[PDB]
Amino acid sequence: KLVRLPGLIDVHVHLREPGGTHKEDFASGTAAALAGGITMVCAMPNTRPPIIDAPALALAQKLAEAGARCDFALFLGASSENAGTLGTVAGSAAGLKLYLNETFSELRLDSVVQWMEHFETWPSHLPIVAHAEQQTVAAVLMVAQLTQRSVHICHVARKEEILLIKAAKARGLPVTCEVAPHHLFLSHDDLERLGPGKGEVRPELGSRQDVEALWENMAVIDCFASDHAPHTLEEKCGSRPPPGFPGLETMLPLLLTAVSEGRLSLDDLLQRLHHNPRRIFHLPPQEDTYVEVDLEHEWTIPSHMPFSKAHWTPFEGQKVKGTVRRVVLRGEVAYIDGQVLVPPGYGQDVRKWPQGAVPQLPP
Amino acid sequence: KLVRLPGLIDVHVHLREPGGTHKEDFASGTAAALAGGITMVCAMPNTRPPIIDAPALALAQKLAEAGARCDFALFLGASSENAGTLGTVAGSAAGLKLYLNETFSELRLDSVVQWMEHFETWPSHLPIVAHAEQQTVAAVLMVAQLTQRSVHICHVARKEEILLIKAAKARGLPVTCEVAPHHLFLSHDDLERLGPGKGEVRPELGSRQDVEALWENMAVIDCFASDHAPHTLEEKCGSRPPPGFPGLETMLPLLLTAVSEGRLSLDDLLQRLHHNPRRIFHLPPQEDTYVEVDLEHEWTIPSHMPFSKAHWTPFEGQKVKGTVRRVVLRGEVAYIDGQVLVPPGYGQDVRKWPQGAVPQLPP
Ligand SMILES: NC(=O)N[C@@H](CC(=O)O)C(=O)O
Ligand SMILES: NC(=O)N[C@@H](CC(=O)O)C(=O)O
Ligand SMILES: [Zn+2]
Ligand SMILES: [Zn+2]
Ligand SMILES: [Zn+2]
Ligand SMILES: [Zn+2]
Ligand SMILES: [Zn+2]
Ligand SMILES: [Zn+2]
């Protein structure tokens, strides 16, 4: 007996096109998404060229329309030069991404004043998300309050961060957050197995206490999102390993395993992979779209999943229970038991759908 | 013709006793204060042992009462273990000091949650000051708002920081700040002369643009305070130079030079070295206390000032105009033209004076 889920949404993926297509491209990354039960993805802007201006966004839109197999929206990235210049294209993006700490990214800002300038100039009704670790979470929350608007915190990984966000929510501040599966299912305990190259990720893997705190504070977590961050094994194991884990193909099975163990409910999962992503980012429904999962199937994660060009996974060897059997996207069979059945280009930019525009007051 | 000033107050000094008395002690550091026209100092807690508990405070109080030549108050320091334990002695301290960044200090905290715990437990009517650089300023401001109280930012050094504080004040937030003379009168341009050891300080010396921004935003600066941070020349020039500059003997002459050039007024100076320190820290008046300065005397700062045991200065070679001629402290001549005339032990703990307690609602 299969369970029918709505089309799941991952608001944090790196699809590497343009410019990093040996790691992933729209076609391979959206194949990975579909195999993971994900029918809509929001792609981050730290590509080459980075998506920090109208011409880069135009290029990325065309590459995505030609290559994506599932539906998508594309983030714009904040830079040290583009505040006040994105107004005409802002509404066509998923939102604006701020990179506020060292990581795989034309996009660290030099000064909190630059953060302020982005919060002041980006349209107030459109999403802002931030890579903001440890005290940076508190700092960007302060900027959001000074500018009287909301912010969404990406990949929360630490007890410190989730408790800060919890305190902010208790004060009624408009903040939401997401958590990635590696910060729920891996910890320092796994670094010996992974090694120092494979284990590189930002935010870094946390202690057992960090992981426990995220689970204990599940009520504070608005979304799950993979931070799918593919790099090749050669890159991960080489002399300057880039941070990041692939995760689209493993996220849902890991979380289904947790559901079957009673660690969270099916509803908790659907709030975090469907309803809350929709409402935070004003993402539209997908007609005739659903995912069928088998909750009984036990398997062990292999050394690589079938679709991502990363061709490795940090979850190798973990025992999971639950698998994606079928995905239907807008009335077409998109995935069945290991086979993707929609071509590159089937996917569409949801921000171009009438129902996918973010509502705003007449300007 | 001399000008009579009130007794000036420096709310940020490191007097190194207990435990670092080769660098400075209460007797030498307060001699330096008097020679700089300062009659009251607030001493930081990063000593050895650090002033982070009642027994350490009791020791420091006695050492100060025996050694100080001018009046004083002693800060307590926040640690990772003492939140919720300082309530009985809190009112006897200048305030609570938080070290939130790497510097010469049992006292960096590991987590913003620890900052929150201090803001929640330290009595709400008593001062909190923070070493908080760059985004850390925004982060600690957020914690202050979450806990509904004020904060004072130590040694603001950058355009980024002063503009953030300016924005916070424009939103009516209860934040005050101080600036140290090296961040007004030295910059990157001086690093070649100073060298990499002598030039080490936290916050580091800023660009010309940082310095210009502090001057342009003088209205945002509530206090001047030296961050007198004496270390010996051997230490500054050795293989692991500690950060910090001595500054008590040079602060007032540097600022008087600026007054005579019309860069700020005498009133601006007195707000920042007398009235605002009094009101932010609830420091009492000193009866029969004043400083006489000669605004016409031109001199060049030598390679060391007479009193600080640091026996070096980063301001060597700077031309100044203005000198302290006489200091009277509580009816006794304390300093005349290079000679200190009150003994170690003349100084008193102002928090023990009836008028020096911080007012509070009956608990
Ligand atoms: N998380 C990572 O370790 N890397 C991400 C960047 C990011 O999400 O910060 C990537 O794009 O590779
Ligand atoms: N400012 C410094 O560079 N050093 C100070 C510590 C401090 O004020 O942060 C010291 O105590 O030496
Ligand atoms: Zn990130
Ligand atoms: Zn994110
Ligand atoms: Zn990312
Ligand atoms: Zn400091
Ligand atoms: Zn200070
Ligand atoms: Zn200091």
Torsion of CA B83, B87, B92, B98, to 10 degrees: 20
Identify the CA nearest to B44 among candidates B103, B86, B88: B103
With beta carbons less than 8 A apart as the criterion, state whether B145 and B151 touch.
Answer: no
* Sheet (strand A332-336) strand order: A3-6, A290-300, A319-329, A332-336, A339-340
List, as one string, the DSSP characters of A52-81: -SHHHHHHHHHHHHHH-SSEEEE-EE--SS
Phi then psi for A341, rounded to 5 degrees? Answer: -125, 10
* Range of the structural domain that residue B226 is part of: 1-363
Cβ neighbours of A166 (radius 10 Å): 16
Active-site residue set of B: 227
Q: Kindly give, in sequence order, each residue whose CB lies less than 8 Å from that of residue A106, ignoring residues fewer than 6 positions away.
A: A50, A52, A79
* Distance (Å, whole) CA B115 – CA B131: 12
CA distance A194 to A313: 10
- Look at ligand 1, atom 4, and give the residue with the nearest C-alpha: A244
The sign one gets for the Cα dihedral B219, B170, A142, B112 is positive
Q: For residue A116, which residues of chain B lie inside 8 Å, CB to CB?
A: 164, 167
Separation CA B14–CA B273 (nearest Å): 17
Write out the two tokens for A269.
């999962």
Q: A332: helix, coil or strand? A: strand
Q: What is the DSSP secondary structure assignment for residue A257, as one 8-state letter?
A: H
**Domain CATH number, residue A297:** 3.20.20.140
Closest to B61 in 3D by CA, of B77, B40, B75: B75
Report residue A93 as tokens.
């993006």
What angle is formed at CA B357 by the lines to CA B351 and CA B362, rounded to 5 degrees? 145
* Distance in angstroms (rounded) separating the CA atoms of residues B287 and B301: 32
Q: What is the 3-state secondary structure (H, E, C) of B301-320?
A: CCCCCCCCCCCCCCCCCCEE
> Which is the closest atom of ligand 2 to the Cα of B231?
12
Q: Which two tokens stand for residue A243?
A: 């941070």
Say how far apart CA A60 and CA A51 lie, in whole Å.
Answer: 8
Cβ-contact B179, B219 below 8 angstroms: no
Cβ-defined contact of A145 to B142 (cutoff 8 Å): yes
C-alpha–C-alpha distance, residues A82 and A293, integer Å: 43
One-character DSSP codes across B173-216:
--EEEEE-THHHH--GGGHHHHHHHHT--SSPPPPHHHHHHHHH
Beta strands in chain A (DSSP E): 3-6, 8-13, 38-43, 71-74, 76-77, 96-99, 128-131, 151-153, 175-179, 223-224, 290-300, 319-329, 332-336, 339-340
* A295/B contact by beta carbon, under 8 A: no
Number of domains in chain A: 1
Instruction: Write the CB contacts of A167 (distance below 8 Å, at least 6 apart in sequence).
Output: B116, B146
B109 touches chain A (CB under 8 A): no
- For residue A68, give every residue at least 6 positions away whose Cβ sits within 8 Å of its Cβ, in sequence order, or none: A26, A27, A30, A344, A345, A346, A347, A348
Q: Is A137 on the interface with B (CB under 8 A)?
A: yes
Q: In B, which residues are within 8 Å of A168 by CB distance?
A: 146
CB-based pocket (< 6 A), ligand 1: A 14, 46, 103-104, 131, 201-202, 227, 229, 242-244
Are B91 and B124 in contact, with CB atoms under 8 Å apart? no
Distance CA B138, CA A132 (A): 13
Resolution (Å units): 1.3
Mutual orientation of helices B112-121 and B135-146 as an angle, nearest 10°? 40
Q: Is B300 exposed, middle or buried (0-12, 13-18, 19+ CB in 10 A)?
A: exposed
Clarify whether A227 is annotated catalytic.
Answer: yes
Helix-helix angle A112-121:B135-146, to 10 degrees? 70
At B224, list the tokens.
């001047």
HSE of B94 in the Cβ direction (CA atoms, 13 Å)? 30
Is B46 among the annotated ligand-binding positions?
A: yes
Candidates A138, A145, A159; nearest CB to B143:
A138
E strand map for chain B: 3-6, 8-13, 38-43, 71-74, 76-77, 96-99, 128-131, 151-153, 175-179, 223-224, 290-300, 319-329, 332-336, 339-340
The Cα–Cα gap between B144 and B122 comes to 12
> What HEC string does A105-149 produce?
CCCCCCCHHHHHHHHHHCCCCCCEEEECCCHHHHHHHHHHHHCCC
The per-residue b/e assignment along B303-325, b for 16 or more CB within 10 angstroms, e otherwise, is ebbebbbbbbbbbbebebbbbbb
Residue B335's Cβ-side half-sphere holds a number of Cα atoms within 13 Å equal to 30
Which of A222, A227, A294, A337 is an active site residue? Answer: A227
Instruction: Return the residue matching tokens 């937030």.
Output: B173
Q: Do B135 and A139 touch (CB under 8 A)?
A: yes
Indicate which residue's Cα is closest to atom 2 of ligand 1: A244
The H or E element spanning position A308 is none
Q: After which residues is chain A broken (C to N over 2.5 A)?
A: 105, 106
Elucidated via: X-ray
Burial of A38 by CB count in 10 Å (0-12 exposed, 13-18 middle, 19+ buried)? buried
Q: State the DSSP code for B80.
A: S
- Which A positions 18-47 lie with beta carbon below 8 A of chain B? none
